[PDB]
Design a protein around this ligand. Structure first.
Ligand SMILES: CN(CCN(C)c1cccc2sc(C(=N)N)cc12)C(=O)C(C)(C)Oc1ccc(Cl)cc1
Ligand SMILES: CN(CCN(C)c1cccc2sc(C(=N)N)cc12)C(=O)C(C)(C)Oc1ccc(Cl)cc1
Lengths: 236, 5, 236, 5
């Protein structure tokens, strides 16, 4: 624990500073240290954790896609052999990405999920588990690509089951979970019809519950509903 | 790419 | 040398890939490895080196400014004491920035500058030396802030003296050097009149030489001339 | 901030 000597509260404070400075690797390391203090995370702290690692892995995924595209081109017919360098460097980025994903999955398994009893925390963490297995799936090609995909699906499914039982259809965590599970179906599991069906049902059931919300909750819910609609427009 | 949060 | 086992050509190739992937820390490390092979750098390779470290330190400077601003506010009258965290984290970023600057200055001193005989390489490296002492100056406050400033000035001055003797007034390295030395005068040395005079003379002498240039060189020179004009507009 | 290259 490189952050083991820093107070939990100081780690959270510095995570917020790192965010303002757009230093997301630092933000992630501060939040990792905060999780490893062993106390449950508040709602704000959970979102600091997810924002930090989302930004880190998001940059890695963007770089991996650039490099994978170059690699695919250099492997086409008529291409000039430039040697092992493109593959080596894509592999380097891929390994770093897998390391970040394993770290996040490690925090969820030790011991954020098992200590999360409320729907709002348990669904949030299981959505994260699905998301980070999804990112591992995006780069997987070995004897365990199918097992990685099923690990993502399993986590997403447990989160959906809880969210449908315990949260209203407009809950932003429920909505965001369905958004991402829908993308999982479309992009990972090769189930575009399930992806479209999930996004549409999620949108329609949220629409019918908007009348119950305050202006501030309405804004939060309609924001994610628009992302569901955006994806449906991309897919139909 | 499609939107995720 | 973490890159000591990689071929020079492979390091340059991976620097270019890292650039396409926007992985500038990797790009800098690859170029550091390439410099440490001990061979002089070509014009393209010099610009890979400078692009990489410019992007790295540029992000650090942006973060340091954010944090220094927060720190200044928390030190105002009526502010709530939040503890040592803001200062500690600004110090952390500052130390990392100083480390990058020292690394670049180290490469220039061992042994890029001493082996650079042509004006185009020698001026490029001395401009870099001025730039990275300037970045050290931006964060300096101790018994050596004045010595850091004079080290920047000395490097810039030697570069100007060579550039005026050996390059045309429209040479983009000469123009960029004058742009940055002008900013040094304005922002570091508290000499705004010298900064404005240098930018104006540089612009006017370049204007009068444009007639000698091809369309492609004209584009390169007028691009930097516009930055000189932009700064003059900011300063008058 | 002013422009540098
Ligand atoms: C507006 N909003 C709420 C989330 N945000 C902004 C925070 C809520 C509570 C505390 C903090 S601390 C913090 C910070 N960046 N320092 C951010 C937040 C969203 O993003 C939408 C509406 C898209 O809802 C979802 C749904 C699921 C998921 Cl997984 C992510 C977003
Ligand atoms: C257009 N231009 C030329 C520089 N550039 C683009 C390269 C020239 C030669 C080789 C390479 S390899 C490479 C790469 N990013 N992979 C970039 C280049 C400039 O930036 C202007 C016009 C602003 O001139 C200056 C002047 C001084 C300084 Cl210090 C920096 C820029």
């Amino acid at each position: 624990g490189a952050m083991g000597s820093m107070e939990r509260a100081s780690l959270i404070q510095k995570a917020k500073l790192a965010e303002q400075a757009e230093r997301y690797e630092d933000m992630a390391a501060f939040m990792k240290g905060a999780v490893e203090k062993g106390e449950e995370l508040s709602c704000e702290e959970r979102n600091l954790l997810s924002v930090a690692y989302k930004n880190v892995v998001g940059g890695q995924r963007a770089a991996w896609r650039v490099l994978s595209s170059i690699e695919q081109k250099s492997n086409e017919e008529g291409s000039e052999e430039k040697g092992p360098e493109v593959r080596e460097y894509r592999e380097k980025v891929e390994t770093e990405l897998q390391g970040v994903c394993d770290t996040v999955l490690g925090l969820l398994d030790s011991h954020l999920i098992k200590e999360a009893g409320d729907a709002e925390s348990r669904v949030f963490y299981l959505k994260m588990k699905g998301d980070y297995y999804r990112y591992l799936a995006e780069v997987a090609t070995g004897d365990d690509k199918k097992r990685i995909i099923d690990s993502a699906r399993s986590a997403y499914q447990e989160a959906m089951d809880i969210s449908k039982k315990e949260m209203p259809p407009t809950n932003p965590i429920r909505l965001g979970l369905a958004l991402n599970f829908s993308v999982f179906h479309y992009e990972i599991a090769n189930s575009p019809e399930e992806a479209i069906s999930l996004a549409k049902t999620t949108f329609d059931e949220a629409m019918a519950d908007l009348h119950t919300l305050s202006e501030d909750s309405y804004k939060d819910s309609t924001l994610i509903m628009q992302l569901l609609r955006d994806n449906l427009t991309l897919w139909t | 790419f499609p939107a995720t949060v």
